[PDB]
Amino acid sequence: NQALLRILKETEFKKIKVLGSGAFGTVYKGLWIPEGEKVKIPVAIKELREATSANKEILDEAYVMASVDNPHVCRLLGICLTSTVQLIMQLMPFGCLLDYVREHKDNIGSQYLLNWCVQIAKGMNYLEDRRLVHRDLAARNVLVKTPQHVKITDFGLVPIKWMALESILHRIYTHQSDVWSYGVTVWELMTFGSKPYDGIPASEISSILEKGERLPQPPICTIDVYMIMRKCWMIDADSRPKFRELIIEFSKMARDPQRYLVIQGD
Numbered sequence: 001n002q003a004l005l006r007i008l009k010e011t012e013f014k015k016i017k018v019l020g021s022g023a024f025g026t027v028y029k030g031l032w033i034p035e036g037e038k039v040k041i042p043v044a045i046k047e048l049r050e051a052t053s054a055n056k057e058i059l060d061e062a063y064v065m066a067s068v069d070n071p072h073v074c075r076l077l078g079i080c081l082t083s084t085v086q087l088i089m090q091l092m093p094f095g096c097l098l099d100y101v102r103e104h105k106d107n108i109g110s111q112y113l114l115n116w117c118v119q120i121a122k123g124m125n126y127l128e129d130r131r132l133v134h135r136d137l138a139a140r141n142v143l144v145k146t147p148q149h150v151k152i153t154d155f156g157l158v159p160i161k162w163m164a165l166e167s168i169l170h171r172i173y174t175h176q177s178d179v180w181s182y183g184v185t186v187w188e189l190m191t192f193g194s195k196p197y198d199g200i201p202a203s204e205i206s207s208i209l210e211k212g213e214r215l216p217q218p219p220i221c222t223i224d225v226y227m228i229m230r231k232c233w234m235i236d237a238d239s240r241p242k243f244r245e246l247i248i249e250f251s252k253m254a255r256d257p258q259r260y261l262v263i264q265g266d
């Protein structure tokens with residue numbers, strides 16, 4: 001347990017290049033140089049903006065994020081605590097899945113898309129088995145280790161357009177509210193990275209959902225696939241599919257991909 005999270009010294013890692021920066025902090029590509037070893041490991045390093053307060057909460061959560069053990073869930077490798085918090089995990093060389101499907105929209109076939117749906121459902125099922133609620137599942141929070149190996153990140157940390165109605169209205173987050181976000185994530189993949197409810201203010205989302213409107217059927221999706229997405233967006237959270245059922249359904253479709261997704265040049 002405790003040995004799953006490495007407490008790193010500033011000597012043990014070096015930031016080499018900027019991968020991205022934003023309100024959250026800065027993510028770097030860098031090297032992990034563990035003391036007493038003769039290897040330099042390429043990693044991603046995230047430096048959080050300085051916290052005013054306490055610091056214990058960040059460390060407590062870090063121990064949890066270091067304990068995950070699933071091929072489709074990112075694991076926290078190490079942490080360095082100074083004036084700032086610095087977080088180290090394996091580099092995902094291909095970036096986030098949302099950008100990946102946008103950049104390769106013309107070269108992605110039905111098998112890739114359905115395999116991603118399986119892998120994301122497997123990671124979410126694992127998090128549910130560990131009693132962890134993600135709360136922020138979106139295509140931007142799936143990272144691409146290799147084109148057919150993706151991993152969920154940033155679980156346990158307002159994304160109105162991905163939230164289930166009960167989360168918007170009542171601040172209720174459960175595994176079933178994650179299923180709703182899974183449905184939106186699948187919609188992003190099937191539209192090759194379109195923005196959900198594009199051009200609609202976030203403040204209007206609750207009313208259009210209350211009105212019974214949902215994201216439209218993607219052109220490539222047959223009715224069998226769209227019906228699964230639609231069930232993820234049922235108002236009754238108990239009526240949504242469970243991640244265990246989604247694994248089975250998408251695994252079945254991945255066995256015959258061309259039957260379930262209609263893509264030009266597939």
Ligand SMILES: *CCC(=O)Nc1cccc(Nc2nc(Nc3ccc(OCCOC)cc3)ncc2F)c1
Pocket residue numbers: 019020027044089090091092093094095096097098099139140141143
């Ligand atoms: C879709 C949202 C998004 O872009 N997330 C993001 C951005 C920057 C860094 C991370 N965290 C992270 N990143 C990687 N790998 C990686 C590789 C290439 C990248 O840039 C591609 C375009 O630039 C030319 C960015 C990130 N690995 C592990 C990580 F935690 C996430």
Ligand SMILES: O=C(Nc1nccs1)[C@@H](c1ccccc1)N1Cc2ccccc2C1=O
Pocket residue numbers: 027044045046058059061062065074075076087088089153154155157
């Ligand atoms: O570290 C993460 N992402 C990275 N990107 C590049 C290097 S680290 C991310 C994460 C990692 C793995 C699983 C879930 C979340 N964390 C952890 C964590 C613990 C405490 C406070 C904040 C965070 C946070 O944002």
Ligand SMILES: [Cl-]
Pocket residue numbers: 195
């Ligand atoms: Cl976007």
